[PDB]
């Protein structure tokens with residue numbers, strides 16, 4: 279009941295919202311200065327949703343380590359008391375790689391939500407649906423289609439007996455697949471180590487004080503900074519992996535302070551910003567393939583792209599139709615970051631400080647948790663309005679209207695379609711894709 283379909287996960291918000299890309303979806307609608315509502319005189323005539331998979335178990339790699347770390351903590355320490363008591367017996371049972379029940383329900387909820395927001399179109403148009411190829415992404419796509427389909431059947435205004443919505447195209451993640459949802463072919467970018475550098479540098483400014491404290495309180499234990507981030511990682515996973523998702527915050531969370539959570543969140547924004555966003559020279563270039571596919575869709579014209587798009591897939595109406603009206607894509611956090619930036623959506627954001635925390639104002643609305651949480655969603659709309667001949671484009675990022683850049687925005691955050699497309703000259707020129715090889 280603090281976890282709803284509409285508002286996302288609002289339980290324990292002072293902690294749970296600062297887990298970055300480990301935070302469960304939470305709607306930013308209340309944080310939107312521009313109203314998400316459709317203005318009067320205006321009609322939505324296009325809706326594309328780009329969605330992340332839902333909450334997942336830790337990867338096999340990381341879980342090994344977590345499990346290993348907690349054994350070592352239990353073998354060595356002589357006082358587990360106060361807030362530490364739970365660690366004595368803690369019995370690591372978490373799954374691996376897979377979506378969690380909670381993660382599953384998130385995408386069901388995203389499906390209901392999408393159905394309803396665009397009801398006057400979802401009632402009789404079957405969306406064209408794509409998915410990167412990874413069990414968790416595919417499954418999440420299908421949990422979204424599941425909830426969309428449940429809402430459609432309860433809707434008196436639906437045209438019933440249309441074909442199912444389904445995953446029309448699973449896009450491959452093999453190292454040689456042109457994949458626009460999360461490209462894997464830009465050799466120089468794949469090799470980049472800028473994110474690591476920033477991660478190490480910024481963790482040296484705040485993790486040592488926590489390490490000290492934790493070794494102090496758990497006599498006999500000796501910890502690396504990395505291990506400390508693992509115990510922080512566990513506060514997300516131990517919360518949203520069990521029954522108690524809605525009722526109890528993980529005991530792990532209480533071992534760190536609010537301010538310590540603030541740094542954690544910001545760290546995660548840094549990993550994403552310098553890994554895949556603007557802070558990485560080739561990051562937004564990872565998004566140009568998808569940006570050119572969106573342009574195709576908005577202009578009902580062929581894809582012009584020579585970066586990450588597959589040409590067999592795109593030059594064929596069956597696998598890339600131009601006049602559907604609704605579209606749903608499912609991918610990972612990393613590719614979604616690159617896409618958001620290639621679209622200009624964060625072009626009023628100043629490169630994040632590598633040394634100090636920057637609040638959500640200083641970053642002009644950018645953070646991991648505000649962009650790619652678990653089950654995140656981007657909605658691109660096109661609407662036709664009373665006062666104007668041309669279609670107006672609008673973009674929401676987890677229920678927050680995000681004012682377009684690179685074109686004459688109005689006060690409602692919108693640009694005319696022609697001027698929006700024109701502003702995406704970066705993607706239209708191929709970005710820096712040529713630098714993937716020299």
Ligand SMILES: *[C@@H]1O[C@H](CO)[C@@H](O)[C@H](O)[C@H]1NC(C)=O
Pocket residue numbers: 454455456457588589590591
């Ligand atoms: C393009 O997609 C096709 C059809 O799914 C696939 O068999 C082929 O490998 C793809 N080519 C690349 C470079 O991804």
Ligand SMILES: *[C@@H]1O[C@H](CO)[C@@H](O)[C@H](O)[C@H]1NC(C)=O
Pocket residue numbers: 347350351354498499500501
């Ligand atoms: C526990 O003790 C072992 C063996 O002395 C040591 O190498 C290890 O790093 C310690 N680990 C922790 C997490 O305290």
Ligand SMILES: *[C@@H]1O[C@H](CO)[C@@H](O)[C@H](O)[C@H]1NC(C)=O
Pocket residue numbers: 620621622625683684685701702703704
């Ligand atoms: C956004 O700013 C970046 C900064 O490099 C620029 O490359 C790009 O053309 C801009 N995009 C838009 C849509 O204005």
